[PDB]
RNA sequence: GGCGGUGCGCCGCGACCGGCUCCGGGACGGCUGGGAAGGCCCCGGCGGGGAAGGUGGCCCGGGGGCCCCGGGUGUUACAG
RNA sequence: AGCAGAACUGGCGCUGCGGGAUGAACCGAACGCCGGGUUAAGGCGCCCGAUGCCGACGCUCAUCAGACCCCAGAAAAGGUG
RNA sequence: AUAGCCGGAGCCUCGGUUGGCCUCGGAUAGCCGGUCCCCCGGGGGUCCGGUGCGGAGAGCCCUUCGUCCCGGGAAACGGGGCGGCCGGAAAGGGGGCCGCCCUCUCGCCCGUCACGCACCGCACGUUCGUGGGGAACCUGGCGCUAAACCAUUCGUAGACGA
C-alpha cells in the first residue's frame, strides 16, 4: 500500500518484478490488511499521478508514461523490502486457505 | 417467594402508624433473606402479620437496608433452623452448612432442602442463622472438614469442554 | 495411584474463568466441591474458587490452614514459584500456544519456508540410515 | 471428507444423535466396530428391552410387520433411522450417506478412526454404573456372527501390530536423525520455536 | 491459486417447529461453534454456486453452465456458532445440506 | 461542449446522509454503615488474655535410618 | 358418570395464530398485504428452530424406573434399598 | 459362453466438490515411549524419562506465480524412464523391491540479472477433471465367430401362465 487517493480508493503497488502488479487502484473494502509494514516515509511518490491518471479512457496498450512511473516508484521500494529478510519471497507467494485454516481463528 | 440466584440478607425495620390512642409504636427489626428488597419487604410483612396485630395498611417501613458480610474471606460453619412444609404435616429441622457468607448458607439451604425433601421456597420459613464454632458442630459431613492436615485427590475428573473437540483421534484421558 | 492432592498450600493452575491462565495457591477447603484459595502474587484476590476450574500442580508451599494473605505472599516469594513455574515443561508448552496464536501471516510464511528444508535434511538424513542399515543387515 | 467413527466404547443414543445431525448436514459418516457400542443399564434390562421389541409384530401378516434387525451394525442403523425424517426425500438421501459395519472392513482397516468424546461411556457414565455390550446383546438375541467377527477382528489385531512396531522403528530412526544434525538445522529450528511449534 | 472462501453448509431456513420462513437462511460455517466467533463473518457476502443445463454468461469469461444466488450474512443465530443469511432470491430446498461459499472481500479488517 | 429534467438495455459495485434496530469498546460521577471487607507500615507498636482444625518442643509406635506418618500433653516455642 | 339441574365470569358456538405428539372449550394471544427487530405461552440431545453454557447444588438403579396444567390411570399397608 | 480390450481430439447430458493424513491394542483409582543390565521361545520383570498428553488431531505432511542466468547451503546413495518378483480374501493395491540404454546436482532453501497483456478497482476465479453417461467421428494393434424365447415334444408338472 502506497497512499490514500482522493476518491477513497487505495493506491496499492507491489513490485512488478515480484507481484507482477502495476500502479493500480483498489477499493479499501475488498482488502485484507496484513500487519506487516515497511517504512515508505522516505519515498517520493509522483504528484502527477492521481485518480484521473488511473481513470479508464475509452484494447489496452501500456503507455510509456506508465512504464516510466512504474520503475520510478519501484526503485525506491525494492531496496527497502530487501532490508527485511525473506520479504521478497513473501510478496512473490500467493495467499490461500488450506484445510483447518479459519480466518476468524488466526490473526494477521 | 422465588429463591432466584443467590440470596441477600436485608435488615428491615417497621412500626405502626401514629394513632390518637398511641403516641409512638414500638419498632420491630427482623433478618430477611430475599433476592431483592422489593420481595424482602413483602416477606417482612408476612412474618410480622403472624406474630403481631400488624398489617401493611396499618404499618410502615422505617428502614430497608442490606447488611454485608463482616468476614466474607473467612470459612465459617453455619447452623440453620427450618420450618418447612411437607405434603402431610409440618416439621422443624436443624441443618449445618459450611460457607463464607450467611446469605450463601441460606442459599445453600434453599437448594439443599428442595433437593432432599422437595420443599418449595414458599413452604420454607427461615427463623435463625447463627455462627457456630467448629468444635460445636454436630453433622459428621461438616465435621469431616475440620482437619488441619486435610488432604484428598480428585479421583474421577469428569472432563468438560467435550464438544469443542467434537471429533478427535486420541481416546481422552480422565486422569490427572 | 494419585500423585497430586488437594491440600493446604498447593499451587494450582486456573482452567477457565476471569482468572484463567494464572497460578493460585490453596489456603483452605470450604466444601466438597469448593475451596478457599488465594493467588497473592498472580493478581488473584482472596476468594472462593471451586475445583471445576483448577488444575493442581506438583508444587507445595507450607503455611497454616487459615493464614492471612501476608504470609501466603511471603511463602510464595520464599519458594519462588514464579521462576520455577516458567522452568516447568507444563508452562513451556502453554506459552508456545499463544506464540502460534499471535503468529502473523508473514510469520506464517517464514515458518512454512523453514519447515520445508528442515524436513528436507531430516528426510535426507533418514534416507542415509535406511540404506546404511540394509548393508549392516546383510 | 468421510467420517470414520470407531464404535467401541460409544453409547448407542449419544453417538446416534451426533451422527444423525452430521449426516443431515451433507457429511458422509461411516460408523465402524458396531459390536463395541455399549448401552447404559444392566444387561438384563436391555435384553427384555429388545425381547419385548421382538414381540411387537403384525398379527395378520408378520412379513409386513417391524423388521427386527439382529446385527449390531443394523441395530445402530435402526436407531439412527428413528432419529431422522426418513419419511421425506431428504431423510432417505441422508441415510445413503450412513454406512455401518461389524468389525472393520479392509476398506477401513488401514485408516485412522475418529472418536467422539461426548458420546463416550467413560465420560457420560459413572464408574459404579452398569453397561451392556451390543455385540453380546446381538448374538444373544439372534446374531450368528459374533465368534465369526471376533476371529476376523483378531486377525487384523497383530497385522496392525506389525505395522505399528514398524512405525515406531521408522520414526525411531527419525527422532535419532535430529540427534546427529542439530548443527545445521538450528537456523530452521529456532524460528520454529519462537513461533511456538517445538517448545 | 487456492481457496478464497470459507466452507459453509446451508442447514435450512429460519423456521419454527410447524412454520418455516424461507426468506432467511441459516448457515453453518466450518470452524465456528460459538456466538462470539461469529462476529468476524457478520456482513460477509455469501453465494450459492450451482450448475444448470442451459449456458449462461459469465463476467470476464466464456459463458458457462454455472449459476449463483448472491446474498449477505446478516446476524448470528442460536448459540453454537450458527448464523443467519439473506439472499436476493430465496434458496431452493435442493441446496439443503450442500456446500455454499462465504467470501471475505466484505472485510472490516 | 456547458446547464436543467427523465432514465441507467442487462448484470453489478461503491460512497455519504437520515430513520428504525441488535451489539461492542472507552472514559466520568453519586449513594451505602458518608460501603462492608481487604492490602502496606516487624504479627504496624504496646499491654492483657483464649483454645485448636495443636506449630515448635517432649513422649510412644513404625519406615528406611536420618526425614515423613499416626496418638497424647501443651498456649505461640523455630507456624499461626 | 364425557349424567341431569342452578349462581357469577370467561370462552367455543361465530375464531383463525404459537404452544400442549393430536385435539371445539387448556395456556398465551385474537387476524387487512409485507420487511426489520423484540417477546408471550412454551421450549433449546435428533426428528425440530434453540444450551455444542468447561451451567450450580443434591436425590434416585427399577428383572413394571421416570419424564410437564388440562390429561388421560391408582389406594391402604410394608421395605435392615 | 458371449453373434469387445489397449491405447487420440471435438459435441450434448448428469451433477456434486475447491490439498492429503497409509491403520497398534487398550485403560480411565491410570497411561505413553525408550534402556535392556534379567528370564525364556514375542511375552513378563526392572530401570530411566514425560503425564492437563508437545513421540500432542489444541496435532502431522505438501505447499504451486511461472521462466532466464550467476553465487552460497544440502546432494552424490539422490530426482525421473520398462520388465518381472512377491506381500492383498471380511467388501481384496497401479504397494514395495530388484536391474535398464537417457536424464542432472536441473530438483529444493537463500541471495543477484532480466522477462512474462501492467487488460487501466469489481462476480460465479482457483481443483477432484483424461469425472460419469451417450451418440458419432480417429488411428492402428489384439481378438470372438454365441445364447435366450416362440414352435413341437415330454408329464416327475399344471386353471392359464409357470
Concatenated DSSP letters of E9-37: EEEEEEE-SS-EEEEEEEEEETT--SGGG
Give the three-state DSSP class for A37.
coil
What residues contact E89, with CB distance under 8 A and at least 6 apart? E69
The answer for A86, left when phi > 0, alpha when psi is -120 to 50, beta otherwise, is left
Using alpha carbons, list the distances in angstroms from residue E63 to B40, E53, E55, E56, E58. Answer: 75, 12, 6, 5, 5
Structure-block grid coordinates of residue A25: 487502484
Instruction: Give the nearest chain C residue to B72 (CA atoms).
Output: C47
Task: Give the C-alpha separation, C42 to C40, whole Å.
Answer: 6
Contact call for residues D188 and C114 (beta carbons, < 8 A)? yes
Q: Are B61 and B92 in contact (CB under 8 A)?
A: no
**Helices assigned H by DSSP within chain C:** 69-79, 81-86, 89-101, 105-137
Maximal CA-CA distance, chain D:
83
C-alpha cell at A43: 519515498
Whole-angstrom distance, CA of residue D42 vs CA of residue D37: 14
Residue with cell 483447518: A100
Q: Residue C98 has which C-alpha cell?
A: 499463544
CA D100 to chain centre: 9
CB neighbour class for D130 (10 Å; exposed up to 12, middle 13-18, buried from 19): exposed
E96 touches chain D (CB under 8 A): yes
Q: Which residue spans within chain E are E strands per DSSP?
A: 5-15, 20-29, 45-58, 61-76, 83-87, 99-103
Positive or negative, the CA dihedral E83, E86, E92, E93 is positive
* Breaks in chain E after residues, C-to-N cutoff 2.5 Å: none
Contact predicate C57/C11, CB 8 Å: yes
Cβ-contact C40, C27 below 8 angstroms: no
Q: How far apart are CA E30 and CA D1, in angstroms?
A: 13
The number of residues in chain B equals 176
- Count of Cβ atoms closer than 10 Å to residue D18 Cβ: 20
Write the residues followed by a gap in chain A (C–N more than 2.5 A).
58
Contact in structure between C69 and C37 (CB atoms under 8 Å): no
Name the DSSP class of E78: S
CA D118 to chain centre: 13
| CA separation for the pair C54, E96 (Å, rounded) | 43
B153 CB contact with strand H at below 7 Å? no
- Inter-chain touch B167–D116, beta carbons under 8 Å: yes
Which chain A residue has its CA at the smallest distance from E108's CA? A29
The answer to whether residues B36 and B74 touch, using CB atoms and an 8 Å cutoff, is: no
Cα A50–Cα A51–Cα A53 angle in degrees, nearest 5: 65
Report the DSSP pairing between strands C34-39 and C44-50: antiparallel
- Chain C residue numbers touching B150 (CB-CB < 8 A): 7-8, 29, 65
Nearest to C92 among D173, D191, D199 (CB): D199
Best of B162, B163, B164, B173 to mutate (most D CBs within 10 Å, chain D): B162
Element holding D190 (H helix, E strand): helix D182-194
CA distance A15 to A34: 17
Nearest CA in chain A to E107: A29
Is the Cβ pair C29, B145 closer than 8 Å? yes
Of A29, A96, A105, the CB nearest to E2: A96
Q: What is residue C4's three-state secondary structure?
A: coil
C-alpha–C-alpha distance, residues D112 and C28, integer Å: 46
Q: Are strands E45-58 and A3-4 parallel, antiparallel or unpaired?
A: unpaired
Q: How far apart are CA A5 and CA A51, in angstroms?
A: 7
Q: Are E81 and E38 in contact (CB under 8 A)?
A: yes
Q: For residue D120, what is its C-alpha cell?
A: 463416550
D20 touches strand G (CB under 7 A): yes
CA distance D62 to chain B (A): 41
Note whether B104 and B6 are within 8 A (CB). Answer: yes
Secondary structure in 3-state letters for C86-103: HCCHHHHHHHHHHHHHCC
3-state secondary structure of B61: strand
**Partners of D5 in the β-ladder:** D31, D114
User: What residues are paired with E84 via a beta bridge?
Assistant: E26
**Which residues touch A63 (CB under 8 Å, ≥6 apart)?**
none
- Beta-bridge partner residues of E21: E14
Size of interface C-D (CB pairs under 8 A): 54
Q: Which of E61, E46, E53 is nearest to E100 (CA)?
A: E46
Indicate the resolution in Å: 2.9
Q: How far is the CA of D167 from the C1' of H20 (A)?
A: 19
Report the protein residue whose CA lies nearest the C1' of nucleotide H107: C120
Phi-psi region of D108 (alpha: psi -120 to 50; beta: other; left: phi over 0): alpha
Q: Which residues pair with C50 in a beta bridge?
A: C34
Q: Are B12 and B30 in contact (CB under 8 A)?
A: yes
C-alpha cell at E59: 463476467
Q: Can you tell me the distance from the alpha carbon of A35 to that of A32, in angstroms, rounded to the nearest whole number? A: 10
Parallel, antiparallel, or unpaired: how do β-strands A3-4 and A24-26 relate?
A: unpaired
Question: Taking a C-beta distance cutoff of 8 angstroms, is the pair D140, D47 a contact?
Answer: yes
Cell numbers at D114, concatenated: 475418529
- Enter the C-alpha cell of residue D92: 432417505
The tally of CA atoms less than 13 A away on the side-chain side of residue D118 is: 14
| C-alpha dihedral (D87, D90, D94, D96), degrees to nearest 10 | 80
Inter-residue contact B5 to B25 (CB < 8 Å): no
DSSP label at residue B21: S
Please name which of B22, B60, B18, B20 lies closest in space to residue B41, comparing C-alpha atoms: B60
Å: D165 CA to H27 C1': 20
Q: How far apart are CA C128 and CA A93, in angstroms?
A: 32
**Helix/strand/coil for B115:** helix
- Determine whether the distance from the CB of D103 to the nearest atom of strand H is below 7 Å: yes
Residue B119 CB: number of other CB atoms within 10 A? 19
Q: Which of E94, E95, E88, E105 is nearest to E27 (CA)?
A: E95
Neighbours of D23 (CB within 10 A): 23
Q: DSSP letters of D62-97?
A: GGGS-----SHHHHHHHHHHTTTTTTSHHHHHHHTT
Residues of chain C found within 8 Å of residue A106, distances taken between Cβ atoms = 103, 105, 108
**Method by which the model was determined:** cryo-EM
3-state class (DSSP) for residue B107: helix
Tell me the three cell numbers of residue B46: 408476612
CB count within 10 Å of CB C14 equals 20
Q: Which residue's entry shows cell 546404511?
A: C132
Helix D72-81 vs helix D12-24: angle between axes, to the nearest 10 degrees?
A: 60
- In eight-state DSSP terms, residue D119 is T
Give the span between the Cα atoms of B39 and B48, in whole angstroms: 14
From C9's Cα to the closest Cα of chain B, the distance in A is: 11
CA–CA separation, B176 vs B7, rounded Å? Answer: 35
Quote the CA–CA distance of C128 and D187 in Å, as a whole number: 22
Return d(Cα B91, Cα B44) in angstroms, integer: 22
Q: Which residues pair with B15 in a beta bridge?
A: B60
Q: What are the grid coordinates assigned to D22, written together?
A: 452430521
The residue with cell 452448612 is: B97
Give the single-character DSSP code of B41. H
DSSP count for chain D of H helices, then E strands: 9, 5
Residue B94 belongs to what H/E stretch? strand B93-99
Give the contacts of A108 (CB within 8 A, at least 6 positions apart): A32, A34, A35, C104, C105, C108, E109
Breaks (C-N over 2.5 A) in chain B follow: none
Give the residue before each break in chain D, using a C-to-N cut-off of over 2.5 angstroms; say none if it is continuous: none
Give the number of other CB atoms < 10 A from CB of residue B56. 15
Instruction: Give me E17's grid cell.
Output: 417447529
Residue A35, helix vs strand vs coil? coil
**Residue C12 neighbours by CB distance under 10 Å:** 24
Which of left, alpha, beta for D103 (phi over 0: left; psi -120 to 50: alpha)? left
- For chain D, how far is it from start to end, CA to CA, in angstroms? 31
Q: Distance in angstroms, CA of B149 to C1' of F60?
A: 21
**Contact indicator for C108, C57 with CB cutoff of 8 Å:** no
Q: Which of D185, D191, D195 sits opposite C121 (nearest CB)?
A: D185
Quick one: which of D42, D47, D39 has its CA closest to D121?
D39
Residue D196 contacts by C-beta under 8 Å, 6 or more apart in sequence?
C95, C96, C97, C98, C99, C100, C103
Q: Cβ(C99)–Cβ(D199) under 8 Å?
A: yes
User: Is C105–A108 a contact, with Cβ atoms under 8 angstroms apart?
Assistant: yes
CA distance D152 to B3: 60
- Taking CB atoms and an 8 Å cutoff, what residues of chain E touch A95? 2, 4
Closest residue, by C-alpha, to the C1' of G52: B163
* Residue of E23, E32, E28, E30 whose CA lies nearest to E6: E30
Distance separating alpha carbons of residues B9 and B27, to the nearest angstrom:
19
Residue D141: CB partners within 8 Å, gap ≥ 6? Answer: D47, D50, D51, D54, D70
Neighbours of D188 (CB within 10 A): 19
SS3 (DSSP) at A71 = helix
B161: left (phi over 0), alpha (psi -120 to 50) or beta: left
> Cβ of E98 under 8 Å from any chain D Cβ?
yes
* Angstrom distance, B123 CA to H51 C1': 51
Alpha-carbon gap, residue B97 to B104, rounded angstroms: 10
Amino acid at each position: 500500500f502506497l497512499k490514500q487517493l482522493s476518491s477513497g480508493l487505495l493506491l496499492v503497488t507491489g513490485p512488478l518484478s515480484l507481484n507482477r502488479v502495476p500502479l493500480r487502484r483498489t477499493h479499501q473494502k475488498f482488502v485484507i490488511a496484513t500487519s506487516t509494514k515497511i517504512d515508505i516515509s522516505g519515498v517520493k511518490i509522483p504528484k502527477h499521478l492521481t485518480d484521473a491518471y488511473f481513470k479508464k479512457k475509452k484494447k489496452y496498450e501500456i503507455t510509456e508514461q506508465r512504464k516510466v512511473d512504474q520503475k520510478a516508484v519501484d526503485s525506491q521500494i525494492l531496496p527497502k523490502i530487501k532490508a527485511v529478510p525473506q520479504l521478497q519471497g513473501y510478496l512473490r507467494s500467493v495467499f490461500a486457505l488450506t484445510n483447518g485454516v479459519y480466518p476468524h481463528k488466526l490473526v494477521f | 417467594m422465588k429463591a432466584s440466584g443467590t440470596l441477600r440478607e436485608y435488615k428491615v425495620v417497621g412500626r405502626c402508624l401514629p394513632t390518637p390512642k398511641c403516641r409512638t409504636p414500638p419498632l420491630y427489626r427482623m433478618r430477611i433473606f430475599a433476592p431483592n428488597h422489593v420481595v424482602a419487604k413483602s416477606r417482612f410483612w408476612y412474618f410480622v402479620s403472624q406474630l403481631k396485630k400488624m398489617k401493611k395498611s396499618s404499618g410502615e417501613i422505617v428502614y430497608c437496608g442490606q447488611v454485608f458480610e463482616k468476614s466474607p474471606l473467612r470459612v465459617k460453619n453455619f447452623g440453620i433452623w427450618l420450618r418447612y412444609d411437607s405434603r402431610s404435616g409440618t416439621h422443624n429441622m436443624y441443618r449445618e452448612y459450611r460457607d463464607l457468607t450467611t446469605a450463601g448458607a441460606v442459599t445453600q439451604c434453599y437448594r439443599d432442602m428442595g433437593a432432599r425433601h422437595r420443599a418449595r421456597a414458599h413452604s420454607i420459613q427461615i427463623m435463625k442463622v447463627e455462627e457456630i464454632a467448629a468444635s460445636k458442630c454436630r453433622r459428621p459431613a461438616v465435621k469431616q472438614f475440620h482437619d488441619s492436615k486435610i488432604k484428598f485427590p480428585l479421583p474421577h475428573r469428569v472432563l468438560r469442554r467435550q464438544h469443542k473437540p467434537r471429533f478427535t483421534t486420541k481416546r481422552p484421558n480422565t486422569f490427572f | 495411584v494419585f500423585r497430586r492432592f488437594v491440600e493446604v498450600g498447593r499451587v494450582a493452575y486456573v482452567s477457565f474463568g476471569p482468572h484463567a491462565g494464572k497460578l493460585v495457591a490453596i489456603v483452605d477447603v470450604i466444601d466438597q466441591n469448593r475451596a478457599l484459595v488465594d493467588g497473592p502474587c498472580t493478581r488473584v484476590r482472596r476468594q472462593a474458587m471451586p475445583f471445576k476450574c483448577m488444575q493442581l500442580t506438583d508444587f507445595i508451599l507450607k503455611f497454616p490452614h487459615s493464614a492471612r494473605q501476608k504470609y501466603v505472599r511471603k511463602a510464595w516469594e520464599k519458594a519462588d514459584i514464579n521462576t520455577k513455574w516458567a522452568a516447568t515443561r507444563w508452562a513451556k508448552k502453554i506459552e508456545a500456544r499463544e506464540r502460534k496464536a499471535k503468529m502473523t501471516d508473514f510469520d506464517r510464511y517464514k515458518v512454512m519456508k523453514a519447515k520445508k528444508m528442515r524436513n528436507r535434511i531430516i528426510k535426507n538424513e533418514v534416507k542415509k540410515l535406511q540404506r546404511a542399515a540394509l548393508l549392516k543387515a546383510s | 471428507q468421510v467420517l470414520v467413527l470407531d464404535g467401541r466404547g460409544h453409547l448407542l443414543g449419544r453417538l446416534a444423535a451426533i451422527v444423525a445431525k452430521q449426516v443431515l448436514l451433507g457429511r458422509k459418516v461411516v460408523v465402524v466396530r458396531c459390536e463395541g457400542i455399549n448401552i447404559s443399564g444392566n444387561f438384563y434390562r436391555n435384553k427384555l428391552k429388545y425381547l419385548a421389541f421382538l414381540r411387537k409384530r403384525m398379527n395378520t401378516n408378520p412379513s409386513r410387520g417391524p423388521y427386527h434387525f439382529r446385527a449390531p451394525s443394523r441395530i445402530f442403523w435402526r436407531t439412527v433411522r428413528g432419529m431422522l425424517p426418513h419419511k421425506t426425500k431428504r431423510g432417505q438421501a441422508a441415510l445413503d450417506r450412513l454406512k455401518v459395519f461389524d468389525g472393520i472392513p479392509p476398506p477401513y482397516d488401514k485408516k485412522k478412526r475418529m472418536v467422539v468424546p461426548a458420546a463416550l461411556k467413560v465420560v457420560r457414565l459413572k464408574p459404579t454404573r452398569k453397561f451392556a455390550y451390543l455385540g453380546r446383546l446381538a448374538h444373544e438375541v439372534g446374531w450368528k456372527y459374533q465368534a465369526v467377527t471376533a476371529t476376523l477382528e483378531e486377525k487384523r489385531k497383530e497385522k496392525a501390530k506389525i505395522h505399528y512396531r514398524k512405525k515406531k522403528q521408522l520414526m525411531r530412526l527419525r527422532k535419532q536423525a535430529e540427534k546427529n544434525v542439530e548443527k545445521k538445522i538450528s537456523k530452521f529450528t529456532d524460528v520454529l520455536k519462537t513461533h511456538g511449534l517445538l517448545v | 491459486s487456492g481457496r478464497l472462501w470459507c466452507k459453509a453448509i446451508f442447514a435450512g431456513y429460519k423456521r419454527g417447529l410447524r412454520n418455516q420462513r424461507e426468506h432467511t437462511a441459516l448457515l453453518k460455517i466450518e470452524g465456528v461453534y460459538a456466538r462470539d466467533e461469529t462476529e468476524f463473518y457478520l456482513g460477509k457476502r455469501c453465494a450459492y454456486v450451482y450448475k444448470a443445463k442451459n449456458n449462461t454468461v459469465t463476467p470476464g469469461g466464456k459463458p458457462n453452465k454455472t449459476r449463483v444466488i448472491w446474498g449477505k450474512v446478516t446476524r448470528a443465530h442460536g448459540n453454537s456458532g450458527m448464523v443467519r443469511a439473506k439472499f436476493r432470491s430465496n434458496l431452493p430446498a435442493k441446496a439443503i445440506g450442500h456446500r455454499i461459499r462465504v467470501m471475505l472481500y466484505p472485510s472490516r479488517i
